[PDB]
């Protein structure tokens, strides 16, 4: 027998029975990654929270040369410390303020965009592909608006993502080509006088403010590339798999259609049960640290399995069921926890809430147009997503 390999399954419509067996028997245990490295896979709520809240389990140290790797880097090593670099530049407050869903008109733009996408699918007739022709275009349009960049530039930036978020054993030549091109695009945006709104408009102003005169042009461009990429891949993939979970639950679909004020609670449960992250969150130990029955040694890789935490019955009883009245509804780990908690969490919630509200109003009869087993799940990728999501209504 060989050492247990991760990831277990690229299917995003169901959790393997294996996760519950593992959490019960060995909530921290040694696995092999796709690179051949060994790692500790953590799968209980208690131990996942412990790792994420202890900064001695470091995300920037995962990029060190010679470290055991979950996958190959698709960005320059310094970008693994992206939020640390942003904070060190004095930019964290401005960046986080620009990516909230609170800017005037933003939520209306989201609703208008969702409704337009859905009207076009209704005109064309069933079947419709809710990933490529709804959820991903909605994420792309949102992030162009949030960044302040032209909508027509969205698709080209989007098409970098099927490579940029690969989970590969080896470096990916195309990832560098696309990264360098996207950095050049964002550098041009910062020099473009017509870009005055959104995140890039704000960074463009701060770039010429004496208080930021020593912040590198490379960092400013990197913020644009990285926030577009992480935001689009994360919101598009989450919404897509949330739609499957909703379609699989006609009673829930009808409840949210009938009572749209329950959509936020519904989205929070869809977040909790979401399988969009294809790999555990990686951290490198910077000291010898006890985690359950294992003494993790300095220099070892730890993988925090989000669905391990989020389906843990000790924290979320009847964990496979969507229940809108849980006492601890936001205590899931869908956005991470601790130092690296997702800075786009509010925007991600709103993207999904508006998308779902619009879908349920326009397509109350939405159902899969193919048997669920026919969905094609993307492999060796940092998200779990079906290549196409064919629906009828
Ligand atoms: C539903 C949508 C989203 C989900 C499920 C999600 C999930 C996550 C998770 C789990 C992390 C933690 C990674 C780790 O600790 O290793 C994270 C970090 C991050 N997310 Fe999100 N995210 C979403 C939306 C967004 C959006 C909209 C943006 C930007 C617009 C964004 C940008 C980031 C960035 C930059 C980080 C790194 C933060 C750091 O290292 O401190 N995400 N996200
Ligand atoms: O390595 C990082 N890189 C970017 C994210 C990123 C990755 C690849 C890209 O091509 C891109 F545009 C953006 C970031 O901000 N933080 C760290 C840690 C990290 C990784 C994955 C992740 O999903 C979220 C965070």
Curated annotation (Swiss-Prot):
It is found in: Cytoplasm. Its main location: cytoplasm. This is Mycocyclosin synthase. Keywords: Cytoplasm, Heme, Iron, Metal-binding, Monooxygenase, Oxidoreductase. Its cofactor is heme. It comes from Mycobacterium tuberculosis (strain CDC 1551 / Oshkosh). Substrate binds at residues 74, 82-83, 234, 298, 382. It catalyses: cyclo(L-tyrosyl-L-tyrosyl) + 2 reduced [2Fe-2S]-[ferredoxin] + O2 + 2 H(+) = mycoclysin + 2 oxidized [2Fe-2S]-[ferredoxin] + 2 H2O. The record marks 165, 179 as: Participates in a stacking interactions with the tyrosyl of cYY. It is an enzyme of class 1 (oxidoreductase). InterPro entries: Cyt_P450 (IPR001128), Cyt_P450_B (IPR002397), Cyt_P450_CS (IPR017972), Cyt_P450_sf (IPR036396). One of its GO terms (molecular function) is oxidoreductase activity, acting on paired donors, with incorporation or reduction of molecular oxygen. SUPFAM superfamilies: Cytochrome P450 (SSF48264). GO terms for cellular component: cytoplasm. Heme binds at residues 283, 340, 342. Pfam families: p450 (PF00067). The record marks 343 as: Important for the position of heme. Its EC number is 1.14.19.70. It comes from the Bacteria. Catalyzes C-C bond formation between the carbons ortho to the phenolic hydroxyl of cyclo(L-tyr-L-tyr) (cYY) producing mycocyclosin. Can also use cyclo(L-Tyr-L-Phe) (cYF), cyclo(L-Tyr-L-Trp) (cYW) and cyclo(L-Tyr-L-3,4-dihydroxyphenylalanine) (cY-DOPA) as substrate. Belongs to the cytochrome P450 family.
